[PDB]
Write a protein that binds this ligand. Structure first.
Ligand SMILES: NC(=O)c1ccc[n+]([C@@H]2O[C@H](COP(=O)([O-])OP(=O)(O)OC[C@H]3O[C@@H](n4cnc5c(N)ncnc54)[C@H](O)[C@@H]3O)[C@@H](O)[C@H]2O)c1
Ligand SMILES: NC(=O)c1ccc[n+]([C@@H]2O[C@H](COP(=O)([O-])OP(=O)(O)OC[C@H]3O[C@@H](n4cnc5c(N)ncnc54)[C@H](O)[C@@H]3O)[C@@H](O)[C@H]2O)c1
Ligand SMILES: [K+]
Ligand SMILES: [K+]
Ligand SMILES: [Zn+2]
Ligand SMILES: [Zn+2]
Ligand SMILES: [Zn+2]
Ligand SMILES: [Zn+2]
Lengths: 373, 373
């Protein structure tokens, strides 16, 4: 019988402070839940945003983390598609396959468990984590900063048993988001002229997608020139630094492309750049995709003339991938070398050093850091 | 040979003043120009915008008007596809068929003569209008408020010679814009749930297009309930007045559609309503179209979360129709009764009462007023 598990986890007792390595208890999975042994995890800006306390919806104490790969340790009642030993990736965007969103080909935003998930709880309204006599909340329905986590059975992607978990955990968010922004949201055509604002992991993934799609010109934009080299390796035909020009960045791009780009992607989360990305698009057919998540309250703006004269403004969540059915396919594309993952890993750390992963992220010295549990 | 023509035209001597019927002189057409006898015309908010003096680009004196239908009186050298007697509709959006925009199937914004057209001149850099010894400017490459006008040969659509000119002159802007916003810009699918903000001529044309496309629900929105009857005649399944509700109109629409509409169209020119129209769209797949050119200056805004979670923002000025090739097809659709035009005409006036057409438009008493030259 499934017993309570005593293991290590990185707990955020309060905002603005380092994660605390603690000994916690993980309850067995209830009906339609899956307990996963996390093998590898990584840190994302979203985790840091919540940890800083700047996130209006952030609640503590909580076990953060939404990028992970592992093995099913046990399943609850009613679970038949998954079993102990299955190789999996936890998903913050689930796929129940029965709601109006899952049934609609135009979206991947399953709403089946969003309410409880937003509160850091399992679908039944409770948490499976406890530490020092306190209930600890879940995060983004995944909580990967633990040796063991429990997730809703619709938040699990079963993947290739041969996949290297110390690499594919990155497909949990960033890589899939950027890649999908190109092939799913923008659906750019061969020969397309593109501009990518922000050359971090997300921007590099967008570039990767543009390349797969057959883009002719891919202009990388970043205020940190140290990001240009890798952007080039991923496919950027050239890179520019907004700081090297007096004119607004959109005017520079328009001049370079004789009118503007066919597709632009904002991978920073800056509302001013999001406007710039839209205005950098070509009149008549340009399309700009917001990939970055801006801070609460901030608004994007532009003159309606921009839309009336042909430009389209879009956005994407997890690259538009129907999670449960698509993540396994993404793993397979990586295994077959259609897409890259290893090239995103710039650092490797042990679980006890998880806080250093956040630090490296602030310094802008890394792309992705994989934490070995 | 083609001689100078002495006729009457409604001249706008200065911003903020009524139009004046004056005796003017119209020069014969030069190379690649066409002189047209205008039979019927109509006024548009755009003409009024320029006339008010609010348009930063407006210059005087000028002969306004861009909605008309007439007969070719004569053609200049080099013109072979058109001849005296041809039934035509002048176009403010030309189609040279050779520029970057004409060659791209995703747009209809021909740029061949935009520079001179913006200055109220023919492609050769001069005007064909004079009045009392003064040069009078052209407008939107059409200047339909004259018994005779001269336009670039790429600004002419040759139509069915049996078409009633006192009706099809309306296809010169609004009707084509609204109809096209539905079938070209939005490309809504059968069964779609739509919302149309503004029930004037443009909004009615959008409704007409949604019905042609097979929409399951078409919710008309207007603060003037007197516009509801005709909206339902055109196909609206429901009509709502924002003033009847205490909460924001987007919240109202979301509630009556269990999440929001599949497509929304803003046909008012109000930036606040444009934002409402976007936010009224369904999460994951909603699309909002800003219909028609609005007044420059004000910006539209929203939180990027709206786009990241699936909504798309678009716009259109002329409904996306490649002008020279499609306007004749629209006339044919009217002749075959696929689309309506007669139903838009609520008033008829003589040329010397042209100012009353402006008054009727601003009072909200009319949908479309046809002015007989
Ligand atoms: N929509 C989604 O589903 C989705 C998924 C994952 C990540 N996010 C968002 O994507 C964004 C990027 O993630 P990341 O891991 O690549 O972050 P990152 O910090 O590693 O990369 C951001 C890059 O933007 C560059 N940058 C910052 N300001 C700039 C400016 N003004 N002009 C040009 N470049 C500038 C930075 O130098 C850095 O290279 C964040 O907002 C993240 O939250 C969204
Ligand atoms: N200066 C300009 O360029 C200018 C000015 C106004 C409108 N626009 C264009 O005019 C076109 C509309 O043309 P039309 O002939 O149909 O105009 P119209 O004036 O006949 O119709 C506009 C309708 O909007 C309704 N309306 C106004 N404010 C409302 C609100 N807050 N909420 C809901 N309904 C409201 C009005 O009652 C009217 O029925 C649009 O394409 C718009 O972009 C341009
Ligand atoms: K596309
Ligand atoms: K569509
Ligand atoms: Zn993330
Ligand atoms: Zn679902
Ligand atoms: Zn008009
Ligand atoms: Zn052209």
């Amino acid at each position: 019988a499934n017993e309570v598990i005593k293991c290590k986890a990185a707990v955020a007792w309060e905002a603005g402070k380092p994660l605390s390595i603690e000994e916690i208890e993980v309850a067995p999975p209830k009906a339609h839940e899956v307990r996963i042994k996390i093998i590898a995890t990584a840190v994302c800006h979203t985790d840091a945003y919540t940890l800083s306390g700047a996130d209006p919806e952030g609640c503590f104490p909580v076990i953060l983390g939404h990028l992970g790969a592992g093995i099913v340790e046990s399943v609850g009642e009613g679970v038949t598609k998954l079993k102990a030993g299955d190789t999996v990736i936890p998903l913050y965007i689930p796929q129940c396959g029965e709601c109006k969103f899952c049934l609609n080909p135009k979206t991947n935003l399953c709403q089946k468990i969003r309410v409880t998930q937003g509160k850091g709880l399992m679908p039944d309204g409770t948490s499976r984590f406890t530490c020092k006599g306190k209930t600890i909340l879940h995060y983004m329905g995944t909580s990967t900063f633990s040796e063991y986590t429990v997730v809703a059975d619709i938040s699990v992607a079963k993947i290739d048993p041969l996949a290297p978990l110390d690499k594919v955990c990155l497909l949990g968010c960033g890589i899939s988001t950027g890649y999908g922004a190109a092939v799913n949201t923008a659906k750019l055509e061969p020969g397309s002229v593109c501009a990518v604002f922000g050359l971090g992991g997300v921007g590099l993934a967008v570039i990767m997608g543009c390349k797969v799609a057959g883009a002719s010109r891919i202009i990388g934009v970043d205020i940190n020139k140290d990001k240009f080299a890798r952007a080039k390796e991923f496919g950027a035909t050239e890179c520019i630094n907004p700081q090297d020009f007096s004119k607004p960045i959109q005017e520079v791009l328009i001049e370079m492309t004789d009118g503007g780009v066919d597709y632009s992607f904002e991978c920073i989360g800056n509302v001013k750049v999001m406007r710039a990305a839209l205005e950098a698009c070509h009149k008549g057919w340009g399309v700009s995709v917001v990939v970055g998540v801006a801070a609460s309250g901030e608004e994007i703006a532009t003159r309606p003339f921009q839309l009336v004269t042909g430009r389209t403004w879009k956005g994407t969540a997890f690259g538009g991938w129907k999670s449960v059915e698509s993540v396994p396919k993404l793993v397979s594309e990586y295994m077959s070398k259609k897409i890259k993952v290893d090239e995103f890993v710039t650092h490797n750390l042990s679980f006890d050093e998880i806080n250093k992963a956040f630090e490296l992220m602030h310094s802008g010295k890394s792309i992705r850091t994989v934490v070995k549990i």
